[PDB]
Design a binder for this molecule. Structure first.
Ligand SMILES: Nc1ncnc2c1ncn2[C@@H]1O[C@H](COP(=O)(O)OP(=O)(O)OP(=O)(O)O)[C@@H](O)[C@H]1O
Length: 664
């Protein structure tokens, strides 16, 4: 039903993906890798003391703080929405094998009963309106680049200088590239400006995943994670099979002679894709302005910061529904890509740019190493990009694509099941824009706060409110999908952007509050996704630059949690039992040390000043920059700090670029 061409590394098409240089060549050949992570300097994630500590802490917490989640997924009481067994993983050792990325998700969507286009004309208008509101009067900004980040295909450079070169060169030449593409000459576009090629697949770790303790056997059981084999991936699920990966860690004993205690498993791995930087630059140049716009003019539903920022908005609702989307990225519809490009073209965007955007969403994928002796295979032909993988985690505007979808999806869910009386307001593009604008500003009886697949759907007092309760009930029964676009459910233990929504006896938004998820603190402190990379001098280029700084923000981030104090004591106690040291002490040391090191990187920090003028956000980001691509944005981070992590291209240069893309 279209098989998707596949090419081995040795094929010329794959070879053209990697430049004549060491780094690039190595990335094309990189074989499957595995190994304990350096959790903290001097501490191996799989060290016996640590696993012991993990076994005791997880069992204890789970036993003394069972979840407090009602029939409707609202969490009350202790703020615990599940057991603490999630920490029981041999971090650094993946489940085998990782999945192969699906080349087409059309069958997948169809078999899941999702639509292959806007189903009604209203929907078609709202999606196009979303595009109109989001991409209009945009302001130029410098194109900020993450430090130590990669250029991926074809150079694989990590040099800031070279990145800036590439980017400037890209904004200068994007236009020729796109026109070349509009003429069907992708190979030329790629050969001449490296805009094309493929995404590079890298498997990332979900350091914690669900684990259950079956009362009968007294043995632990890990959530099975389904993966696809090469056959399945190239046939869109037609041929091939789709089985559960093995999380069994026993192998670690024979292979590496590591004592794997009972009830510990290999970690879940998620496919991640690095995009060809020459292609993402032109895109990022528009994407950031768009973020700025929606986070400013549409701050009500899009821009989120503190636990209280969220509280203000929800407290005022009569009903709060915490949604849940199944496998967002892989279901994301290509028809939406095409819809968006079409509308962009209508609004007046340079076709060459739109063409780049489009192409970035149908690009081939190079699979690295999903498992031992597996991979190094290119999926799809770069000469005629036509994959349909959903959303590529490393495309320049991934967050916007997920937010543009989902946001309209949720509104439609609301219109469809609770606010039929609003349809008359959506008659044509103008009325649609007018309506959406109002809605995104929190100015209607129905509201939402979201970021891609995370959302809190709300109802104020009114006509639609009775509908809202019916909807919530549809969700609890969970026998019927409330949407034609994506598989939707309610989150069991609702929370938004990391903070758990804590309901009291009343069980209503007004008397509820937003507390930090303490299980998150546990994940962050004992199951980091990456090691400390003590071998990297430049801390700014590390995945975790200043791990110690999180101690400083801990209270502010998680203090509001009902059993905050108890957990800390439990930790302290268990750490004593396992190390004969005080965890609090350990952290204060790490904290002093990192606070010191930091001043080296901050030009405005006295060479020994304090974390005096640093946001709690500043601290969490410095300890984990991942937070900067999922919880917050350039916006929420102090500019001092921002320069530590990012580096930009001249506004002069983006401004000139943007002026040629933008309609007006
Ligand atoms: N701190 C975090 N830890 C894990 N995932 C996170 C975290 N923060 C944000 N996410 C995200 O939320 C997602 C939703 O998780 P997931 O895809 O596994 O779905 P699920 O609801 O948990 O299970 P399933 O899809 O199999 O039905 C991820 O794909 C990821 O991008």
């Amino acid at each position: 039903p279209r098989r998707a061409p596949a090419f081995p590394l040795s094929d010329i098409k794959a070879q053209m993906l990697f430049a004549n240089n060491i780094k690039a060549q190595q990335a094309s050949k990189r074989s499957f890798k595995e190994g304990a992570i350096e959790t903290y300097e001097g501490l191996l994630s799989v060290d016996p003391r640590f696993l012991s500590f993990k076994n005791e802490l997880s069992r204890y917490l789970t036993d003394h703080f069972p979840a407090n989640v009602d029939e409707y997924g609202r969490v009350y009481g202790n703020g615990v929405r599940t057991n603490f067994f999630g920490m029981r993983h041999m971090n650094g050792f993946p489940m085998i094998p990782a999945t192969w990325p699906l080349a087409s998700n059309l069958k997948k969507r169809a078999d899941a009963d999702l639509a292959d286009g806007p189903v009604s004309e209203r929907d078609n208008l709202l999606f196009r309106a979303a595009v109109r509101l989001m991409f209009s009067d945009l302001e130029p900004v410098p194109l900020k680049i993450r430090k130590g980040s990669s250029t991926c295909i074809p150079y694989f450079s990590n040099d800031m200088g070279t990145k800036i070169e590439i980017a400037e060169r890209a904004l200068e030449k994007a236009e020729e590239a796109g026109n070349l593409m509009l003429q069907g000459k992708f190979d030329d576009a790629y050969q001449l400006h490296q805009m094309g090629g493929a995404y590079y697949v890298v498997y990332r770790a979900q350091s914690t995943d669900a684990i259950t303790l079956d009362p009968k056997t007294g043995k632990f059981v890990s959530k099975d994670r389904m993966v696809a084999d090469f056959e399945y991936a190239v046939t869109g699920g037609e041929q091939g099979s789709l089985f559960a990966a093995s999380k069994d860690a026993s192998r670690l004993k024979e292979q590496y002679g590591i004592d794997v205690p009972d009830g510990f498993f290999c970690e879940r791995r998620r496919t991640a894709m690095g995009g060809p930087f020459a292609l993402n630059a032109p895109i990022m140049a528009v994407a950031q302005p768009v973020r700025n716009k929606i986070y400013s003019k549409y701050a009500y539903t899009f821009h989120h910061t503190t636990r209280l920022n969220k509280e203000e908005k929800v407290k005022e609702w009569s009903l709060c529904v915490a949604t849940d989307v199944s496998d967002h990225d892989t279901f994301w519809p290509g028809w939406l890509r095409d819809l968006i490009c079409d509308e962009l073209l209508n609004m007046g965007y340079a076709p060459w740019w739109v063409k780049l955007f489009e192409t970035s969403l149908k690009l081939p994928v190079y699979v690295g190493a999903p498992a031992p002796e597996q991979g190094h295979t290119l999926l799809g032909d770069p000469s005629n990009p036509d994959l349909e993988v959903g959303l590529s985690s490393g495309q320049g505007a991934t967050d916007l694509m997920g937010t543009l979808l989902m946001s309209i999806t949720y509104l439609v869910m609301q219109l469809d099941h609770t606010a039929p009386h609003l349809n008359s307001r959506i008659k044509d593009m103008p009325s649609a824009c007018r309506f959406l604008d109002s809605y995104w500003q929190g100015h209607e009886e129905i509201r939402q706060i979201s970021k891609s697949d995370d959302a809190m759907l709300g109802w104020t007092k009114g006509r639609a409110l009775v509908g809202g309760h019916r909807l919530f009930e549809m969700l609890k029964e969970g026998k019927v999908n409330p949407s034609p676009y994506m598989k939707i459910s309610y989150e069991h233990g609702g929370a938004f952007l990391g903070d758990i929504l804590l309901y009291d006896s009343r069980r209503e938004p007004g008397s509820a509050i937003f507390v930090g998820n303490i299980n998150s603190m546990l994940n962050n402190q004992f199951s980091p996704e990456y090691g400390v990379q003590s071998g990297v001098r430049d801390r700014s280029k590390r995945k975790r630059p200043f791990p110690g700084l999180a101690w400083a923000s801990m209270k502010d981030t998680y203090g509001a949690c009902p059993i905050y104090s108890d957990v800390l004591e439990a930790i302290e106690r268990c750490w004593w039992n396992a190390f004969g040291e005080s965890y609090r002490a350990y952290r204060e040391d790490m904290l002093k040390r990192d606070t010191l090191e930091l001043s080296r990187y901050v030009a405005s920090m006295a060479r020994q000043a304090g974390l005096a003028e640093l946001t709690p956000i500043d601290l969490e980001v410095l300890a984990d920059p991942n937070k900067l691509q999922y919880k917050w944005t350039e916006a929420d981070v102090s500019a001092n700090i921002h320069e530590v992590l990012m580096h930009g291209v001249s506004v002069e240069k983006t401004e000139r670029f943007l002026r040629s893309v933008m309609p007006r």
